Structure formats: structure tokens, C-alpha cells
Symmetry: C3
Subunit: 242 residues, 3 copies
Amino acid sequence: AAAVRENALLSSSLWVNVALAGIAILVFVYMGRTIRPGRPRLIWGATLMIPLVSISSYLGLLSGLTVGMIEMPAGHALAGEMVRSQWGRYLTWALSTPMILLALGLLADVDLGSLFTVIAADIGMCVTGLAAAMTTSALLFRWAFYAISCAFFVVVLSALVTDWAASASSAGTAEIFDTLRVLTVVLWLGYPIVWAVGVEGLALVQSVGVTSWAYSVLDVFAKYVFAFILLRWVANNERTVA
Amino acid sequence: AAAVRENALLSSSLWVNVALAGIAILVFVYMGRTIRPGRPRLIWGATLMIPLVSISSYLGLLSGLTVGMIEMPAGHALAGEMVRSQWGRYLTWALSTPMILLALGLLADVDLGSLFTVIAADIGMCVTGLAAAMTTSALLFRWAFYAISCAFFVVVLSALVTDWAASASSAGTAEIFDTLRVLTVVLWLGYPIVWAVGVEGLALVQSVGVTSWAYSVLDVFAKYVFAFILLRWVANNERTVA
Amino acid sequence: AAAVRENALLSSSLWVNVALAGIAILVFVYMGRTIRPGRPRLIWGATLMIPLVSISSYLGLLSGLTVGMIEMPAGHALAGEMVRSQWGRYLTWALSTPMILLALGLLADVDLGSLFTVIAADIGMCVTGLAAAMTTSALLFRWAFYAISCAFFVVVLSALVTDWAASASSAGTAEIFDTLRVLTVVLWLGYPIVWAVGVEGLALVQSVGVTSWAYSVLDVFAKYVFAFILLRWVANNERTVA
Ligand SMILES: *C/C=C(C)/C=C/C=C(C)/C=C/C1=C(C)CCCC1(C)C
Ligand SMILES: *C/C=C(C)/C=C/C=C(C)/C=C/C1=C(C)CCCC1(C)C
Ligand SMILES: *C/C=C(C)/C=C/C=C(C)/C=C/C1=C(C)CCCC1(C)C
Ligand SMILES: CCCCCCCCO[C@@H]1O[C@H](CO)[C@@H](O)[C@H](O)[C@H]1O
Ligand SMILES: CCCCCCCCO[C@@H]1O[C@H](CO)[C@@H](O)[C@H](O)[C@H]1O
Ligand SMILES: CCCCCCCCO[C@@H]1O[C@H](CO)[C@@H](O)[C@H](O)[C@H]1O
Ligand SMILES: [Cl-]
Ligand SMILES: [Cl-]
Ligand SMILES: [Cl-]
């Protein structure tokens, strides 16, 4: 009907990324066999962690381990209903987005003070997003947590468009950093946009299947494709980095 | 009566810090507009994270997300009763007290070996404190976990009064470190004192409202005021740090 | 009978490590009184954290805090039954095995890029192992999570047998690193072997008592004895390290 249909959107959006993460793992391992030790191999190891965390996350959601029903508060578009929350996505973003930040930070050769603060701000972003999805008592707190999460996000992007970009400029990865950083701000902006537009925020799109697929498509560009671009440039520019 | 009264203590002690953390965020952002890039801006970014974690924590407790009832074991002063545990406080101390340690560690220019161990010992302190509050099976374990937590605390203070202080002495922040470190050991000693004296330990003070307010007052000095002192000295001593 | 017997295996395997961890703490503190500041004292502090995390973990399992019943999926050897899962072991490995990696990384003087990736891969190993034990919906996911965990394990061992070993060779701890790294790969291989052979995997050994004792014996060599060897060599080689 539309529950046949809704359950077919959900499972396919999970199984596709279990597949592509696994392939990405296999491709990145293959690519590491051609990379010289040093700062190259160190970026490769951090990058390989991105799809390994990702496949664990989708196995988490698929196995039911990291999914639950959350009752939506009054004034929510779906007030009084139990929607299935893919809260495992927030959990695993917490370990996967620092992996990305570690790769970008190694590439740009950022200072470690900056690295810790960004990864800390990034873990803040992820966790308050989880609080936003888990909050049932009042609609106000759901968006309060959303706004606070955006504040951490703003700290993460600010450090990239300034401090880390400056560091890549004096590390000789200035150009490749520009591309990944353009790619990071555009795709990462998609997630709070999917949150607001979709079932958990405004619920202008009410399918849990659809918003799940939106996240899954974002995961394709922000994890696997992003990672693939990084490694390819690295295997082609091993002097500039080491 | 006294439940009117008890619920008025609890909500005010949460809402006050949601307010002051938010103001502190606004004030620290304002203050960052005058700070030169380098080690100054890096201390500022770490410091700004302190009240952003704090407002998320109080929103967590206020929204009911991170509060539960814990049945107290036999021999507890309130044996057989369900007290409301603000366990969200332990959770968030785990992410906020490393922020403080990061700021103090950047300021003193500590070695990274020391930084990791302290933050690890500090996360140990926080987590076993949570275990102490969550344990229901026996009073012995509650204080066992308490004592172990104090052992991590002792590791954290030892590194500050020696290794990090020595590092600040050869970093030229020797004096400002002295003040913050005096301020840190005094206020941080308050938390295990509030734990023992209040409802969760000995329960010589049995109000959950009151012990919550005690923590909230400690949070005012150990997060916002502490942070405000750091930033002010930094905006006045930007050569010494960079 | 055999539940008298089974509950006697479980409690003794927990209480023995609460005892030996506590003794180990006392012995390592004593040993730190003779260690010179610098890279020596920094390895000592990281090492002391190993048994302090360990005693908290066993107090967690003993107090019932971090133990639950998991219903085993169809096709499991114990399909349809509730076995007691010592999931607290996975939780605490997550904070204790980075402590070990920190000590080995300080000793070998590894690069910080390598340190973060290994500790990240190691936390991945631990967490997906927990997912493996917690998964109830299907036997496939339990071993899927197992295989993914082994992939992180493989990343951790690879970095040790190459990158960190190379770093110890140019740090002068080349020899002591060889011994600890031989000791680490052998003992760490025991844990996924106990997982597969014991109640949670294949259940060729079905006692929860017995598999718990297997883990406890592994904890004796991989935490306390390992740590004791490190400190002894350090107190005897303080020039080579500093
Ligand atoms: C690979 C996964 C990535 C890069 C995920 C990024 C996720 C975010 C940038 C999430 C952002 C959110 C906000 C900024 C507001 C609150 C809701 C969130 C958590 C979706
Ligand atoms: C901003 C929040 C801060 C600085 C919190 C500090 C918390 C502590 C120092 C907690 C200490 C505790 C012990 C030492 C014993 C067990 C109970 C605790 C967790 C309250
Ligand atoms: C002190 C505790 C230590 C060193 C524990 C190490 C644990 C492991 C190496 C666990 C390995 C596992 C796998 C590789 C597969 C999945 C099951 C685990 C988590 C037992
Ligand atoms: C991007 C942030 C804009 C939204 C900020 C908070 C909006 C208040 O909340 C929203 O109000 C609407 C009223 O029916 C509902 O449709 C939504 O489900 C609800 O989340
Ligand atoms: C600062 C640590 C001192 C206390 C150590 C453990 C004390 C044992 O426990 C205490 O015993 C009392 C007996 O009624 C009770 O009032 C307390 O509620 C209980 O926690
Ligand atoms: C080391 C990994 C080898 C096992 C891989 C997955 C094995 C499938 O699973 C196993 O099948 C058996 C059939 O009865 C059962 O005895 C086990 O309990 C079950 O876990
Ligand atoms: Cl993820
Ligand atoms: Cl906090
Ligand atoms: Cl452990």
C-alpha cells in the first residue's frame, strides 16, 4: 500500500550504504597499497576509517540496534505519534565526522589546538542533534537543541574557512583543501536542512523512508565520494604532503 | 507546600544556568572579535566551548532527557525511595571539563602526553561519578565508585599543581596559570563535597532542589566566571601567549 | 548444583580482577615515586590509568550496573534463551585499550597522526564488538559486527607491527617495543578468540562463568602484567626515553 512502500524506502536506503561503504572500504584498501609511508599513509589511514565507521552505522540501523520510536510533542506536525527515529545516525556521525576532520586536518597540517577544538565542537554538534531527535517533553527543547547544534556547526565551518584554510596555504595543500572545504560546507549544510524539512523537524516531508534516503544520499557524497577524492589527490601529490 | 517548594528550587536552578550560559556565550563571542589569531584565538575557541556545552547540559536536564529516578539501596539515608537523579550533569561534565583542561593546557603550553592523560583521567573521574549515582544494587559500590572517582580527580589535580604549572612557568603564563589553578582546585573540590553532603551520598542535605542549586552555583564559578577570567587576561596579554 | 557452580565462576572471575587491579594500582603508584619527570613520568601516568579503568569496569559488572540479559537469535547455539551479557567489558575496553595505546605510543614516540587513527580504530573495534553482543534481531548482524570489529583490530595491529615499531626504532625504545608488541598481538588475539569460542559467538563453551573467566585471565596479562613490564623497563631505562 503505502506501508509496503514506506518500508521499502527505509530498507533500501540502509542496504545501499552498507553496500557502498563496503565497496569503498575495499577500494580504499586497494588504493593504500600504492601510497608511500609518511603524511600520505597517515591521511590514508584516517580516510579508510570513514567508510568503516559508516558500514558499522548502517549495520546498526539495519539490525534494529540503533532505531527507536519517539513520541512527537504537541505542536509537532505529527504531534501524538510514534515515528521511528534513526538515532543511530547521530551516534555514528559522532565518530565518523571527526575522522573526516582528522583527514582534512592532517592534509592542511593544522595546529593541534585547532584540531581538538573542531573535533570537540563537532562532537557537540552531533550530540545535541541527538538530543534534538530524542526530546519528547516539549517542541521548544527540540528546536532549542537544534539551534545549539547549529552553533557548534558554525564553529566547525568557521575554523575550516579560516584557520585550517590558512594552514593548508602554508602547507602546500592550499588548493586541494579549497576543493574539499567547498565540498564539506555544501554537503554538511544538507544535514540540518534535511533535519528541518523532514519528519523530525518541520515534517514538510513526512515519510521516514524519504528523509532516511535524503541522509543516505548525503552520506554518499560526504563520506565515500569525499574520501575517494582525497585519496586520489593524495596518491597523485605525495611530495607536496610529505 | 514543600513539593511546590521543592519543584521551584529545581526548575530555577536549571533555568538560571541556561540563562547565564547563554549570556556567557554571547559575551565570549563578542570578546573574540578583538583577539589576534594564533595561540590567543585557540584559547578563545576552547573557552567558548565551555558555556556551549553547559547550555546543552541544562537544556538536557530541563527537557527531562537526562534525568531519572534511582532507587536508593539499603543503608542509604533515603533507602527504598526514588530520588530524581540529575545524571545528565555527569554526562556533560565529561565533555565540558576536558574543554577547561584544554584551555588551561593551551595556556600553560603543556606537553600533549600530559594533556591526553589528564583528559583521560578527567573522563574517568566523570564516568565513575555517574556509575556512583546510577548504582542501585548496594551502598558499597556507590562509595566504591566515589572513591575511584576521587582517585582520578587526584591524578587531575596532581598534574595541574606540578607538570602543567611547570609548563606555564616556561611558557610565560606562569602567573595567570597560578590564579586559574588556585581557582580550579578550590571549585572542583566542591563537587565531590556536594556529592557526599547531598542527597546522593550521605544525604545530610536531602532536598534534590538544594543539592541541584549547589551544583548550579559551582557551575557559575567553574565554567562562566573561570572562563571570563581566562579570556580577559588573554585579551590583555596577547604577546605573552603567542 | 550447576547454578551454584555457574554463579561461583562468575563472581570469583569479577572479584579477582577487582583485587588485582587495586593491588596493581597500589604497586604502580609506589613505583612512580622513583621515576624522573619527563617522558618517563608521562608513560607512568598513562600506565597507571590502565588498572584504574580496569577496577572501575569490574566494579561496574559486579554492581550489576553494566550487565544485562540478551535474547539470542535463531540459529544461535542458545537460540531463544536469555544469557547474561557482560557488555560493561566492551564499554570499558573502549577507555582502557586507548590507555595502553597511549603508553605504547609515548614509549615508541609515534607520530600523533598515527596515535589518533589507532585510538580511533581501536574505539571502533570496541564499539562494534559491543554491537555484536547487543544484537538480537538476527545472527547475521552479530557476526557482521564481529567481522567489522576484526577489521578495526587489523588496522590497530598493522600500525603497531609497522609504523609504531619503526618509530620506536628511531626512538631507541626499539627493543622494549618489540617485547610489548609481541605481548600485545598475542594477548589481544585472545579476545576475539574467546568471543567466537564462547557463549556469545559459536558457544562451543556455553558457560557464562567460563567465558567470563577467560576474559578475566586475558585481562591479567594484557592490563596488569603488560603494565608492570612497561614500568619496570622504564624505571631501568630513564635516559633512553627522556
Ligand atoms: C558523514 C556525516 C556527516 C558529514 C554529518 C554531518 C551532520 C551534520 C552537519 C548535522 C547537523 C545538524 C545540525 C547543524 C542541527 C541539528 C540537526 C543536525 C544534527 C542534523
Ligand atoms: C564544570 C564542571 C566541573 C568542573 C565539574 C567537576 C566535577 C568533579 C570534580 C566531580 C567530582 C566527583 C568526585 C571527585 C567523586 C565522585 C563524585 C563526583 C563525580 C561529583
Ligand atoms: C585490556 C583489554 C583488551 C586489550 C581488550 C582487547 C579486546 C579486543 C582485542 C577485542 C576484539 C574483538 C574482536 C576483534 C571481534 C569482535 C569481538 C571483540 C570485541 C572481542
Ligand atoms: C529552520 C528552523 C525553523 C523552525 C523553528 C521552530 C519552528 C517551530 O516548530 C515547528 O512549528 C510548526 C507548526 O506547525 C510545525 O509544522 C513543525 O512540525 C514544528 O517543528
Ligand atoms: C566522604 C565519604 C564518607 C562516607 C563513606 C561511606 C559512608 C557509608 O555510607 C553512608 O552511611 C550513612 C549511614 O546512615 C548514610 O547516612 C549515608 O546515606 C550512606 O551513604
Ligand atoms: C570465527 C567466525 C566463524 C563463525 C562465522 C559465523 C558462523 C555462523 O554462526 C554460528 O553458526 C553455528 C550453527 O549452529 C552456531 O553454533 C553458532 O552459535 C553461530 O554463531
Ligand atoms: Cl556514521
Ligand atoms: Cl556540563
Ligand atoms: Cl576495561
